[PDB]
Ligand binder design. Structure first.
Ligand code: CLA
Ligand code: CLA
Ligand code: CLA
Ligand code: CLA
Ligand code: CLA
Ligand code: CLA
Ligand code: CLA
Ligand code: LMG
Ligand code: II0
Ligand code: IHT
Ligand code: IHT
Lengths: 69, 170, 174, 139, 104, 151, 169
């Protein structure tokens, strides 16, 4: 079974990074909507952080799998 | 055909005369077409051994021949003003400026070629039945009286009407 | 219009006397199948690699570098490849030649478009070709020892596949 | 009257449904019509083509293919300006439709009736009566 | 068959349209663009600790040692060969699409 | 860019110009095949096609025929190929009788004489190509098996 | 140009630019804005310059708050991860401050902001060249030192002064 670890600040770090990464990506790649202060609303923010919890969950599970944690 | 036959006829005669150093310890006492067989029993692919003698001949003759393949194909379709047989080979000036040669020397080449076709055909069949080889055959003008025990060729079927239908004096 | 090297063949259409190392040798018509400039770059690449390969064979007979005998005991010509894949030497040379090939690939596309001559990487640090007449004869000599080293590299490695001796050890031990 | 061979053809990208060797060795049919627009129509032999504003020209293998297009061109684009030709490989061009300038469903003077039988269909002759006789069954 | 270069021959993909197949550039880039990621090792019995390209490149030589004999059904050669070429064909297809069409 | 166009500029002919149909590679192969190659007599077209077809015919008859497991397998396979070649030549002859009117033209395939030329070449080439395959298989043990002599 | 002589001049760069050497073989300058590219090169350089010291100095001296782990590289797995989280957000605040809300290629350089400059001054073309080339060097050196400490699993100068063991993984 792929090893997973109990929540630590390291798990938080990956999640925070991934959420911010997607918030910046969402400002760039969301085609229909002051780098983050133009046209930024809740559906844009709620979508980029939804992909952050998808990317972050995948990254956390993968880094636990290989040993990086 | 004539050039190959001239080479084969001279080759059979000189093979009877002597052999190169070390050939005798490998092939033994075979004489003409049997030596073709003997090498081929000792060569990779056809036989089992450490030799590539007939295969080396096939390799380099085949390189030359594919070159002449393109030459003949070009000459057939009229793309070239080259005559038959002319490969430009005349290293010693014999035709005095033309590699094709004079009318007389190409007539000589064709006539000697035709003679050598007949002659090497005779030599091969005289060996296939007596086993003597050119010079022993020409010496042994009474023939079938005592002949050399020589192997069956790689085409033994062809020597199967000799005894049953034909007389088989041997 | 007859081939110089093969007198009974027509002069190959795609071939021209401007090319370095030209002798009219393409009896199979392979200069028409693939583009002649791609073929020139391929041949020159083969020339230079096999020149290093032949010189490497010869030099590795003559001497080895300090500590090499520690790592390679009896492996001589292509056995040293097998033992130095285990060690890092072969991977290192592969990485750096592949690094160079990336820009070589850009340069091959460049010479395809027509901006660059094949095999031309502007590498003349010691100014050997400055005269403009030496430059041509150097191009001819590069292709000549390049072709000869392709044949030689093959002819040594196969001599070593037979005997195991290597080039100089084949000669000295007949 | 004669087909002006130079009339431009509707923009079409081609299809496998067009004419075959029998058109170039037996006969070919052509249809011309005037379009007020540069509009898409359906080819009888396949997909869609675009007729150019002004005069168009097509070549088809069957007479029915030219008229099936004529029906469509008159029912959806209200073009009634269509002329159908038969073309032989000898170069002879044979005007076909409408044969005398007026459509067949409209009467015209100088049309002679062909195939008209003076009695009703039940008044034909029985086959036994005309057996081994050349006499026709239509009375 | 034949390969056409990036430079302009008179090759036409169809009746009247000349089209430069970029067989040198696409084949080289697709090969390298697939082989280098595929160097990623994996301690799986099929790979054996190598990457997919390298386990495959290892399996060409092992079966070449037994040159007349073909690789067996359970031999890792076939799976490695199929997977390597599947990615290679895909990168060649995508590389031809990317290079010929987008031109940059 | 578009790879499919109407066939020979004609949008209304029953064909398309596709890469399989009209690429430079296709045109090359078609133009250089014996049926379409220029400078070839119909007799020579028949010979080259015949040599090709007769040569491959010997193999399926030899390897998979009824006498395949016998020592007369190659003889039976050649004669089977020879029988097919003779049957096919009758097919060629009757096609010429019913398809072409008699005209002096003889350098085209689709003429009465040109077909008779092509049929003559095809029969000679087919027997020649089948005979060549017979000679090669008889003598070379690799061809007698599927390459199975090496294992 | 002049760096890779068997290739063309990029013709999107010039000797006006600080660290110019004509080295753009892949032609990235053609596909992306060169103000953004310069910007990214200066920034990556400066961060990696700080990172070279960030790998060097904690070997000799590590702050009393933390525990140093085994190597200055490995120290991120032994310091509290929330400390690195605060570094991440603090650097984000600096990005959204030093850039006046402009964080995208379309947005930066709108008022004529020169790539390197963040308001710490104006420097000679030579001085900007010095920064760029040292930055490029420390980028390469950061790659070298990080993977060195990763493979050796020991510190950089301890490895250099002690037996210079090859990197093996
Ligand atoms: C740093 C980031 C990171 C890392 C190291 C990994 C690493 C991994 N992921 Mg993860 N992943 C990531 C980010 C990451 N991923 C992100 C951002 C997503 C998007 C949400 C995913 C979504 C994802 C899914 C959905 C799955 C993985 C799986 C895997 C593992 C096996 C993949 C494999 O060999 O299949 C090879 C299979 C083949 C068919 C290839 C031939 C591998 C350890 C898989 C797994 O088995 O996890 C247990 C799996 O199911 N990943
Ligand atoms: C295909 C024909 C054929 C065959 C089977 C052989 C086989 C042999 N030759 Mg001969 N040879 C041939 C053609 C052939 N040669 C030709 C065309 C020439 C050119 C004239 C020679 C010239 C030649 C010479 C001059 C000598 C041999 C010798 C030998 C023997 C070598 C023993 C040894 O230690 O090598 C060592 C020798 C060499 C590697 C090269 C010499 C060997 C049995 C040698 C011999 O008789 O020693 C017993 C010897 O001295 N050969
Ligand atoms: C891939 C090739 C290769 C390999 C495997 C080696 C391996 C080795 N070299 Mg050599 N070396 C090489 C190429 C190679 N070198 C090259 C290209 C040069 C430059 C010309 C050198 C120059 C060199 C010197 C000068 C010395 C070594 C030494 C050594 C050994 C280290 C021993 C020690 O105590 O330190 C080691 C076995 C040392 C040793 O003990 O060798 C006797 C030593 O003094 N090497
Ligand atoms: C660009 C810089 C660079 C760097 C950082 C390295 C780094 C290395 N090379 Mg590589 N190498 C390079 C360029 C480089 N190489 C180039 C341009 C070539 C020519 C193709 C090679 C050819 C090469 C070979 C053939 C070998 C190395 C080896 C080594 C290792 C020596 C380890 C050691 O103890 O060093 C201390 C030793 C010295 C400083 C000697 C001087 C190390 C991984 C050796 C190794 O073990 O491979 C992993 C080895 O055998 N290198
Ligand atoms: C620069 C080109 C070059 C040179 C100088 C040599 C030189 C040599 N080769 Mg190599 N060889 C070459 C290219 C070359 N070869 C190439 C391109 C191949 C193709 C793979 C070979 C394959 C090859 C094999 C397989 C063998 C040699 C052998 C020989 C040696 C004896 C010559 C011989 O038997 O030929 C005879 C020449 C004639 C009959 C000329 C007429 C000699 C040292 C032999 C040897 O002793 O090596 C162990 C041997 O067995 N060579
Ligand atoms: C497998 C490798 C691969 C992949 C995934 C891509 C993907 C992409 N390329 Mg690239 N390219 C490749 C190889 C590849 N390329 C190579 C080898 C070359 C050099 C010859 C190029 C040269 C090139 C140029 C010059 C350009 C692109 C561009 C693009 C993008 C859109 C156009 C396109 O090809 O649509 C492909 C579309 C997708 C991949 C997304 C669709 C999603 C589905 C699921 C496709 C999946 C296909 C396949 C199953 C994935 C296989 C992966 C692997 C297992 C082989 C896209 C991101 C263009 C671009 O956007 O610029 C950045 C562009 O200008 N490419
Ligand atoms: C809150 C975080 C944050 C934000 C919003 C920014 C914003 C910016 N940075 Mg900065 N940066 C940060 C943190 C941040 N930075 C930190 C902590 C570092 C490391 C010290 C850097 C290092 C850095 C460099 C070296 C460069 C920038 C650049 C940029 C600009 C464009 C990229 C962008 O919009 O964000 C994108 C960035 C982030 C969302 C956070 C970046 C933090 C790094 C990259 C961690 C990412 C981990 C992972 C390896 C990313 C790969 C993705 C994938 C493999 C998973 C913009 C001004 C670039 C530029 O063009 O200069 C203006 C540039 O060259 N920044
Ligand atoms: C007009 C003739 C034009 C060509 C003329 C060339 C020769 C003319 C002069 C000859 C006189 C000297 C005699 C030399 C004889 C040389 C004999 C020789 O070298 O043989 C050469 C070869 C092989 O024969 C032997 O091979 C052995 C190893 O097996 C050895 O290596 C020997 O080299 C070789 O003798 O014979 C052939 O050429 C056969 C024809 C080509 C076969 C190619 C492979 C088979 C392809 C089949 C795949 C197609 C699809 C199959 C479908 C599924 C099937 C299950
Ligand atoms: C061209 C070219 C050059 C060259 C060259 C070369 C190498 C030329 C070689 C020429 C040769 C070898 C010609 C030989 C012909 C042989 C004949 C006619 C004999 C046939 C046998 C008969 C009739 C018989 C018989 C027999 C019977 C049947 C039974 C047997 O028991 C015995 C018996 C023998 C009696 C050079 C290099 C000079 C340069 C020049 O610038 C251009
Ligand atoms: C496999 C292996 C590895 C290796 C390796 C290496 C280094 C392999 C290198 C192989 C090479 C270079 C082979 C070259 C052969 C040359 C030939 C056939 C040319 C013949 C010329 C001819 C026929 C005639 C030409 C001509 C003549 C004069 C007459 C006519 C005119 C013309 C046509 C011009 C390693 C490293 C992994 C080690 C591992 O343990 C084993
Ligand atoms: C190497 C090898 C082999 C081999 C072999 C070889 C080289 C075999 C060569 C066979 C040859 C060349 C036979 C010659 C036949 C010519 C004839 C019969 C002319 C006949 C009759 C007349 C009337 C001519 C009349 C004429 C004259 C008088 C003047 C009038 C006109 C004309 C009619 C033209 C094997 C097969 C043994 C296998 C072995 O394992 C390996």
């Amino acid at each position: 079974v792929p090893q997973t670890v109990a929540w630590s600040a390291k798990t938080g770090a990956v999640m925070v990074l991934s959420n911010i990464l997607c918030i910046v990506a969402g400002r760039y790649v969301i085609q229909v909507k002051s780098g983050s202060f133009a046209g930024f609303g809740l559906p844009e923010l709620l979508a980029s952080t939804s992909l952050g919890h998808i990317v972050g969950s995948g990254a956390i599970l993968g880094l636990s799998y290989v040993g990086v944690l | 055909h004539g050039r190959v036959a001239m080479l084969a006829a001279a080759g059979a005669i000189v093979q009877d005369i002597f052999t190169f150093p070390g050939v005798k310890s490998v092939i033994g006492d075979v004489k003409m077409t049997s030596v073709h067989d003997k090498f081929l029993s000792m060569e990779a692919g056809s036989g089992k051994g450490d030799m590539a003698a007939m295969h080396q001949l096939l390799l380099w003759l085949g390189l030359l021949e594919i070159a002449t393949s393109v030459a003949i194909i070009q000459s057939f379709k009229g793309e070239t003003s080259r005559g038959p047989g002319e490969f430009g080979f005349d290293p010693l000036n014999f035709g005095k400026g033309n590699s094709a040669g004079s009318d007389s020397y190409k007539l000589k080449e064709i006539k000697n070629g035709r003679l050598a076709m007949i002659g090497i055909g005779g030599m091969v069949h005289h060996y296939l039945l007596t086993g003597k080889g050119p010079l022993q055959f020409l010496g042994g003008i009474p023939n079938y009286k005592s002949c050399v025990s020589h192997p069956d060729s790689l085409l033994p079927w062809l020597f199967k009407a000799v005894g049953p239908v034909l007389p088989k004096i041997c | 219009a007859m081939s110089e090297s093969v007198p009974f063949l027509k002069k190959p259409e795609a071939l021209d006397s401007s090319m370095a190392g030209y002798a009219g040798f393409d009896p199979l018509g392979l200069s028409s199948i693939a583009d002649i400039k791609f073929l020139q770059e391929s041949e020159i690449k083969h020339c230079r690699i096999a020149m290093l390969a032949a010189a490497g064979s010869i030099a590795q007979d003559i001497f080895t570098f300090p500590g090499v005998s520690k790592v390679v005991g009896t492996a001589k010509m292509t056995g040293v490849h097998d033992v130095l894949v285990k060690q890092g030497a072969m991977g290192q040379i592969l990485l750096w030649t592949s690094f160079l090939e990336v820009f070589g690939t850009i340069a091959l596309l460049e010479t395809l478009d027509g901006k660059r001559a094949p095999g031309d990487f502007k590498f003349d640090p010691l100014g050997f070709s400055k005269n403009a007449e030496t430059a041509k004869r150097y191009q001819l000599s590069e292709i000549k020892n390049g072709r000869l080293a392709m044949l030689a590299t093959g002819g040594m490695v196969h001599g070593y596949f037979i005997t195991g001796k290597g080039p100089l050890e084949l000669l000295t031990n007949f | 009257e004669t087909l002006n061979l130079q009339i431009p053809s509707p923009t079409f990208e081609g299809s496998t449904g067009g004419w075959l060797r029998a058109a170039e060795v037996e006969e070919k049919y052509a249809i011309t019509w005037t379009s007020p627009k540069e509009q898409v129509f359906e080819m009888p032999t396949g997909g869609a083509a675009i007729m150019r504003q002004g005069e168009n020209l097509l070549y088809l293998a069957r007479k029915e293919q030219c008229l099936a297009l004529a029906t469509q061109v008159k029912n959806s684009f209200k073009i009634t300006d269509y002329k159908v030709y038969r073309i032989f490989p000898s170069g002879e061009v044979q005007y076909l439709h409408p044969k005398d300038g007026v459509f067949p469903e409209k009467v015209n003077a100088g049309r002679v009736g062909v195939g008209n039988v003076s009695h009703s269909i039940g008044k034909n002759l029985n086959p036994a009566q005309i057996k081994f006789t050349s006499k026709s069954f239509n009375g | 068959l034949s390969v056409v270069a990036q430079s302009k021959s008179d090759f036409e993909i169809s009746d009247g349209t000349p089209y430069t197949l970029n067989v040198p550039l696409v084949g080289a880039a697709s090969f390298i663009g697939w082989v280098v990621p595929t160097l990623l090792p994996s301690q799986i019995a099929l790979y054996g600790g190598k990457g997919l390209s390298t386990a495959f490149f290892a399996s060409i030589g092992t079966n070449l040692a037994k040159f007349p004999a073909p690789p067996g059904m359970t031999d890792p050669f076939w799976l490695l060969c199929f997977i390597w070429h599947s990615g290679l064909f895909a990168t060649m297809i995508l590389g031809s699409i990317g290079y010929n069409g987008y031109a940059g | 860019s578009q790879f499919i166009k109407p066939y020979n500029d004609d949008p209304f002919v029953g064909n398309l110009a596709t890469p399989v149909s009209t690429s430079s590679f296709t045109k090359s192969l078609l133009s250089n095949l014996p049926a379409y190659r220029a400078g070839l007599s119909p007799l020579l077209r028949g010979v080259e096609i015949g040599l090709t077809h007769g040569y491959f015919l010997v193999g399926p008859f030899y390897k998979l025929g009824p006498l395949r497991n016998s020592d007369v397998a190659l003889l039976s396979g050649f004669f089977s190929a020879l029988g097919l070649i003779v049957i096919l030549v009758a097919c060629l002859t009757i096609y010429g009788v019913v398809s072409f009117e008699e005209t002096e033209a003889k350098d085209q395939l689709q003429t009465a004489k040109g077909w008779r030329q092509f049929t003559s070449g095809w029969l000679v080439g087919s027997v020649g190509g089948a005979s060549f395959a017979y000679i090669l298989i008889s003598n070379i043990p690799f061809l007698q098996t599927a390459g199975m002599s090496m294992l | 140009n002049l760096a890779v002589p068997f290739l063309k001049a990029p013709a999107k760069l010039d000797s006006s630019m600080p660290g110019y050497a004509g080295f753009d073989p892949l032609g990235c300058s053609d596909f992306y804005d060169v103000k953004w590219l310069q910007e990214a090169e200066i920034k990556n350089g400066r961060v990696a310059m700080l990172g070279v010291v960030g790998l060097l100095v904690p070997e000799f001296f590590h702050l009393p708050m933390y525990t140093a782990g085994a190597t200055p590289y490995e120290s991120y797995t032994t310091v509290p991860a929330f400390a690195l989280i605060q570094i991440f957000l603090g650097c984000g605040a600096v990005e959204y401050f030093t850039h006046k809300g402009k964080i995208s290629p379309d947005n930066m350089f709108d008022g004529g902001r020169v790539p390197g400059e963040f308001g710490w001054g104006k420097a000679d073309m030579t001085m900007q060249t010095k920064e760029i080339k040292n930055g490029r060097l420390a980028m390469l050196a950061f790659g070298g030192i990080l993977h060195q400490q990763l493979f050796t699993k020991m510190g950089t100068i301890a490895h250099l002064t002690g037996g210079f063991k090859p990197l093996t993984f």
